[PDB]
Every structure is written in structure tokens, then in C-alpha cells.
Design a protein around this ligand. Structure first.
Ligand SMILES: [Ca+2]
Length: 223
């Protein structure tokens, strides 16, 4: 997160870290046994870390659970990042408490102008490199589809939306991938892509979660 703020320990209790020997992507806990992330975050050997604040210090509220299965969306296109969504099933159920909690899936899609909360442990610089130890947060609005399409002509599908600031300075970044965009108490987006981070006229592009709720519910009910 570029231009964000320190969230505060466990104030984003649905945020997870995906770890393959090192933090590499974010995700969101949607019930005791399932996490949603980005399909471009796929790898083998995922451990899901819940209840994290400082990802480099064991502070006492963590739960570390290995993934039993990953399921990339059937229509994921790694070239265009269309359908950039994946489900991760935990080998055992997390214990839900005040520091580890699930986020609701949307019943209705979110609207332009809504302010959302984006969070993660990704890069905090626009062209330099600095990765934080503690979770960072960003408030950012959903942009109109016409502005999104103007920023990235020929690149935006109906499964994507833009959020952020056309003037630049505030955005998600590498390492935040897979993490949440929460609007009005619902998981509406997944950190997906962008040209650089926090560049002028290049806002963040997010997987539109409300298009996937049927697939998520059916997949959970079957695995
Ligand atoms: Ca920790």
C-alpha cells in the first residue's frame, strides 16, 4: 500500500497473509475453512496466516494453517487477468474470535463513489522499494467505469473495476495482490493489477467479486 496508514493490530480481522516460505500475497477469510485470493497468486505449498499484524514477529494471536486445496477460477486468463480469483481451502477450520473473523460476500455490486478499505503488506513506495512488517490500510473510492476504461483502454472487462486516485500518490501495490477491498461491510474487490503503483491516471484495478458469488457458494458447497 502506497500512501496509506498503519491499520492497527487485528483491526482488519479477515485479512490473511499467504506464505510460501515468505509473505507473497494477501487474501480474505470468508468462513472458517475458506479464503478468497487472486488467481495470479497461485502457487503450490501455501500456508495461510491469520491473525497477523507484524508478519515477521510471532505476537501471539496468529493461526497458521496449511492449504489443503487451491481452486483457480475456471475462466482465469493470466494474460488479461480476466477472472483473477481463486479459492483456498484450509486443512483445518480456523477458530473465529475478535482477531480472526470472516468477511461477508456481497449480495449486490458496489457503486461508483463508494469509499472502500484496501489493506495489505505490499510495497509502500511508488518507484522505490520498501515492504512493511505491519499491516497497512488505504481508503479509496470506486471510480466510474467510464474513467476506468479511459485509464486502461482496451483492457477493462466487466469483471474488473477501478478504485483510487487519478492524481496518484495513493494505491495498492505488489505484495497486496489477492487482498481485500471492503465496501459497506462486504468483500467487493480483490487486489489484481495496475500500471505501476500510485501513478497519475493509472488507478488500481480490482476483481469484481459480486460477479463470482454463485461460483463461490457452489464451490464451497461441494468441496
Ligand atoms: Ca505475526
Amino acid at each position: 500500500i502506497v500512501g496509506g496508514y498503519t491499520c492497527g493490530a487485528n483491526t482488519v480481522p479477515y485479512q490473511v497473509s499467504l506464505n510460501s516460505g515468505y509473505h507473497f500475497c494477501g487474501g480474505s477469510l470468508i468462513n472458517s475453512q475458506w479464503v478468497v485470493s487472486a488467481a495470479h497468486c497461485y502457487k503450490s505449498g501455501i500456508q495461510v496466516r491469520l491473525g497477523e499484524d507484524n508478519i515477521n514477529v510471532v505476537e501471539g494471536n496468529e493461526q497458521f494453517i496449511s492449504a489443503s486445496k487451491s481452486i483457480v477460477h475456471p475462466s482465469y486468463n493470466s494474460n488479461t487477468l480476466n477472472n483473477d480469483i481463486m479459492l483456498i481451502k484450509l486443512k483445518s477450520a480456523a477458530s473465529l474470535n475478535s482477531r480472526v473473523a470472516s468477511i461477508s460476500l456481497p449480495t449486490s455490486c458496489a457503486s461508483a463513489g463508494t469509499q472502500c478499505l484496501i489493506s495489505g503488506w505490499g510495497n509502500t513506495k511508488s518507484s522505490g522499494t520498501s515492504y512493511p512488517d505491519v499491516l497497512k490500510c488505504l481508503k479509496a473510492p470506486i471510480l466510474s467505469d467510464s474513467s476506468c476504461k479511459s485509464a486502461y483502454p482496451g483492457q477493462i472487462t466487466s469483471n474488473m473495476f477501478c478504485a483510487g486516485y487519478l492524481e496518484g500518490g495513493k494505491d495498492s501495490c505488489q505484495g497486496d495482490s489477492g487482498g481485500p477491498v471492503v465496501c459497506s461491510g462486504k468483500l467487493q474487490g480483490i487486489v489484481s493489477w495496475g500500471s505501476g503503483c500510485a501513478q497519475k491516471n493509472k488507478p488500481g484495478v480490482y476483481t469484481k467479486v459480486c460477479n463470482y458469488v454463485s461460483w463461490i457458494k457452489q464451490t464451497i458447497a461441494s468441496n
